[PDB]
Write an enzyme that holds these catalytic residues in place. Structure first.
Site, short mmCIF file in Angstrom:
data_model
loop_
_atom_site.label_atom_id
_atom_site.label_comp_id
_atom_site.label_asym_id
_atom_site.label_seq_id
_atom_site.Cartn_x
_atom_site.Cartn_y
_atom_site.Cartn_z
N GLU A 1 -0.55 9.79 -2.47
CA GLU A 1 0.44 8.93 -1.83
C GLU A 1 0.73 7.73 -2.73
OE1 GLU A 1 1.13 7.44 2.77
OE2 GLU A 1 -0.83 7.11 1.81
N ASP A 11 1.77 -3.57 6.27
CA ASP A 11 0.48 -3.30 5.64
C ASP A 11 -0.61 -4.32 5.88
OD1 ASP A 11 2.75 -2.06 3.89
OD2 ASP A 11 0.97 -0.88 3.40
#
Length: 244
Positions: free
Chosen positions: A36, A47
Site C-alpha cells: 500500500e 490519519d
C-alpha cells in the site's frame, strides 16, 4: 487482491525520498502479500499521528503527485505484487479522476483507496475506475454502521479496508468489534489497519478473520527514525511481526 494471512506493508511515497521508498518496498516484498503506497497530502485529517508526520516529511522533502507513479513503475520492473494506491480526494479531483486513474493503471497500480471520497461522487468514481481497470478499496472505521458496511461491500472490487483512529499497547475492542461485524457482512476480503506493533497483534487479528494485516505505523515509525538507513530495521520489524 491478496492471499489470506497476508501482511500488507504500507509506506508513504517519498519518505525520505521516492528512490528510498522504492528501496524499502523491494526490501519487504519477500514478506508482503500486497503493498500500500500513500500519497502525501497537506491535510491528512483522517490519519493517525505517525502517518501524518510521514506526509509532513514527504512534502518537506519536495514531493509531487506524479512521483508516486515512478515508485510503482520502477517497482514493477521487479515485482507483480498487487499495489494499492492510497490518497485523499483532493489530489485526484484536481488532476482529473479518469486522467489520474488511467495514469496509475499505466505505472502498474492495481487498486486505489480514496480515504475521503464524497458520497456525492462515489458512484461516478467507482464506474470510472472500473472502466480504467482500477479495483476500488473503501474504508470503514469503528463508527461505521452495519448498513454502510454493506453499501461499501457492494461497491468494492478490491477489498474493504478497516481502520481505527484509536491506535493501541493493545488492539482496542472497538476495532475487534468492527472486524467481527465486517466479516459477518462483507463478501469481499478485508484488510485491517489497526496500527499493529506486536507479533501477538498479527496472530490475533488473522485468527479473528482479518484476511490481511496492514503494517504502516510501525514501519513509518522506523523510517522517520533511520531515514535512508531504515531498510534493515524494517525487515527485522516485519520478521518480528511474523515471528521469524
Amino acid at each position: 487482491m491478496f492471499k489470506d494471512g497476508s501482511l500488507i506493508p504500507y509506506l508513504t511515497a517519498g519518505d525520505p525520498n521516492k528512490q528510498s521508498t522504492l528501496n524499502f518496498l523491494l526490501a519487504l516484498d519477500e514478506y508482503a502479500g500486497a503493498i500500500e503506497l500513500g500519497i502525501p497530502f497537506s491535510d491528512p485529517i483522517a490519519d493517525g499521528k505517525t502517518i501524518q508526520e510521514s506526509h509532513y516529511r514527504a512534502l518537506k522533502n519536495g514531493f509531487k503527485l506524479r512521483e508516486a507513479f515512478w515508485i510503482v513503475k520502477e517497482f514493477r520492473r521487479h515485482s507483480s505484487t498487487p499495489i494499492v494506491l492510497m490518497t485523499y480526494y483532493n489530489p485526484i479531483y484536481r488532476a482529473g479522476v479518469r486522467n489520474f486513474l488511467a495514469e496509475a493503471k499505466a505505472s502498474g497500480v492495481d487498486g486505489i483507496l480514496v480515504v475521503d471520497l464524497p458520497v456525492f461522487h462515489a458512484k461516478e468514481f467507482t464506474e470510472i475506475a472500473r472502466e480504467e481497470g482500477i479495483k476500488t478499496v473503501f474504508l470503514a472505521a469503528p463508527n461505521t454502521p452495519d448498513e454502510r458496511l454493506k453499501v461499501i461491500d457492494d461497491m468494492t472490487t478490491g477489498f474493504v479496508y478497516l481502520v481505527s483512529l484509536y491506535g493501541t499497547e493493545e488492539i482496542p475492542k472497538t476495532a475487534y468489534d468492527l472486524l467481527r461485524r465486517a466479516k459477518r457482512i462483507c463478501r469481499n476480503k478485508v484488510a485491517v489497519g489497526f496500527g499493529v506493533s506486536k507479533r501477538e497483534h498479527v496472530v490475533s487479528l488473522l485468527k479473528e478473520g482479518a484476511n490481511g494485516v496492514v503494517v504502516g505505523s510501525a514501519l513509518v515509525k522506523i523510517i522517520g527514525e533511520k531515514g535512508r538507513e531504515a531498510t534493515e530495521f524494517l525487515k527485522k520489524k516485519v520478521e518480528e511481526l511474523l515471528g521469524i
